[PDB]
Amino acid sequence: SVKGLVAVITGGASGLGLATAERLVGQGASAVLLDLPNSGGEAQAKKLGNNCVFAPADVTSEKDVQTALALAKGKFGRVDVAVNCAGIAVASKTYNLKKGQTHTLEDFQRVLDVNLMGTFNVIRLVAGEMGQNEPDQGGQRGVIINTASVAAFEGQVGQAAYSASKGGIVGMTLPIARDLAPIGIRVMTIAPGLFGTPLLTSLPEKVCNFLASQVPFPSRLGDPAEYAHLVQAIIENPFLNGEVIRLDGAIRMQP
RNA sequence: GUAAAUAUAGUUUAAAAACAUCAGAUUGUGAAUCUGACAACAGAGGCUUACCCCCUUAUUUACCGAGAAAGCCAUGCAUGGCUUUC
Numbered sequence: 001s002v003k004g005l006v007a008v009i010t011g012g013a014s015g016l017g018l019a020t021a022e023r024l025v026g027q028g029a030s031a032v033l034l035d036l037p038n039s040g041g042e043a044q045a046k047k048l049g050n051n052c053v054f055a056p057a058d059v060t061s062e063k064d065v066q067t068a069l070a071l072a073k074g075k076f077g078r079v080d081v082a083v084n085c086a087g088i089a090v091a092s093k094t095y096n097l098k099k100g101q102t103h104t105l106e107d108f109q110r111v112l113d114v115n116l117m118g119t120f121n122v123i124r125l126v127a128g129e130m131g132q133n134e135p136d137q138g139g140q141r142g143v144i145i146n147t148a149s150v151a152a153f154e155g156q157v158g159q160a161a162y163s164a165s166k167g168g169i170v171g172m173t174l175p176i177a178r179d180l181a182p183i184g185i186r187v188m189t190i191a192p193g194l195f196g197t198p199l200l201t202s203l204p205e206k207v208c209n210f211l212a213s214q215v216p217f218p219s220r221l222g223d224p225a226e227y228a229h230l231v232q233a234i235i236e237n238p239f240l241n242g243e244v245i246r247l248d249g250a251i252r253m254q255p
Numbered sequence: 256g257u258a259a260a261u262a263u264a265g266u267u268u269a270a271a272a273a274c275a276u277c278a279g280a281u282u283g284u285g286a287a288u289c290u291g292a293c294a295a296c297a298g299a300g301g302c303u304u305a306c307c308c309c310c311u312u313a314u315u316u317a318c319c320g321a322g323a324a325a326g327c328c329a330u331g332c333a334u335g336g337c338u339u340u341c
């Protein structure tokens with residue numbers, strides 16, 4: 001069970017973060033949806049009930065995340081789990097010879113800031129918050145679960161910046177786990193494949209059908225409920241640490 | 256086997272369109288496109304400007320011989336049986 005746990009879910013107003021919040025609150029936990037002010041996260045928080053609260057914050061801003069964690073601590077008294085699901089996607093080729101078009105540096109920089117820098121900002125602040133928790137019978141003060149992508153391993157054409165940020169998350173998973181091992185905080189990463197979230201369901205139906213056919217088995221877009229299930233499995237297993245799990249249905253992206 | 260109808264070669268409704276098909280396009284999210292390929296209303300034969308038919312296959316449906324006239328018998332003017340004629 002995860003009853004009584006407090007989860008800070010960044011990007012918790014939509015998609016994978018929303019599914020994780022729904023599952024965890026359904027099992028009896030308390031959730032803090034840390035999201036952007038104009039993401040409609042207050043409606044989701046109210047829909048989830050009393051055990052869910054909304055924190056309007058930008059993961060790329062230290063002050064916003066600090067205020068969100070202060071709100072979480074005041075409302076629920078502590079933080080046990082952190083789920084970094086905030087992120088943005090951008091498609092852009094590094095260089096197009098035919099069009100003479102070059103990848104803009106702003107796109108790369110903002111993708112980095114939102115994904116990699118935002119994940120690290122949340123991780124460090126929430127690790128500081130967890131360090132105050134009395135270790136349990138197993139000596140654990142908390143769990144941090146980051147959302148990478150399979151683009152961190154076989155990113156496609158136009159995914160240079162996205163792949164850079166997700167590969168950064170993958171590369172920094174183990175060092176942070178080693179850093180926080182003395183503190184008793186487990187650090188894990190989930191690298192989902194193609195999931196039926198607003199980041200993908202907004203595409204034309206033919207594209208969605210093709211993507212579903214591209215998954216070996218099951219030949220469908222991943223359900224966010226499956227991501228939530230894997231997150232809960234990581235939370236409950238005390239021996240999963242410093243590892244990246246590919247929740248992608250055995251797909252390997254084509255160029 | 257013999258008469259009728261019917262026959263859309265990717266599909267459908269019409270009497271030409273819509274959906275489809277093949278090749279190329281590294282497409283900035285209407286590519287929901289652009290450049291091309293294919294385009295034969297079952298198959299073959301004329302004949303008057305135009306005026307339709309004849310034939311061959313394919314599918315579905317139904318498939319080869321007793322009228323009247325007169326004389327007699329039985330039943331309740333009508334019916335059944337028989338005899339001679341065309």
Ligand SMILES: NC(=O)c1ccc[n+]([C@@H]2O[C@H](COP(=O)([O-])OP(=O)(O)OC[C@H]3O[C@@H](n4cnc5c(N)ncnc54)[C@H](O)[C@@H]3O)[C@@H](O)[C@H]2O)c1
Pocket residue numbers: 010011012013014015016017034035036039057058059060085086087088089114118147148149150191192193194195196197198199200
């Ligand atoms: N959708 C997929 O198929 C897929 C696959 C692999 C990885 N991922 C990653 O999984 C994560 C889950 O996102 P999703 O798929 O649900 O898409 P999503 O857009 O539905 O979820 C992203 C969430 O992050 C929030 N957010 C964005 N920028 C933020 C910021 N600066 N501060 C705070 N909150 C912010 C958004 O408001 C939203 O709630 C993302 O990081 C995504 O890149 C998604």
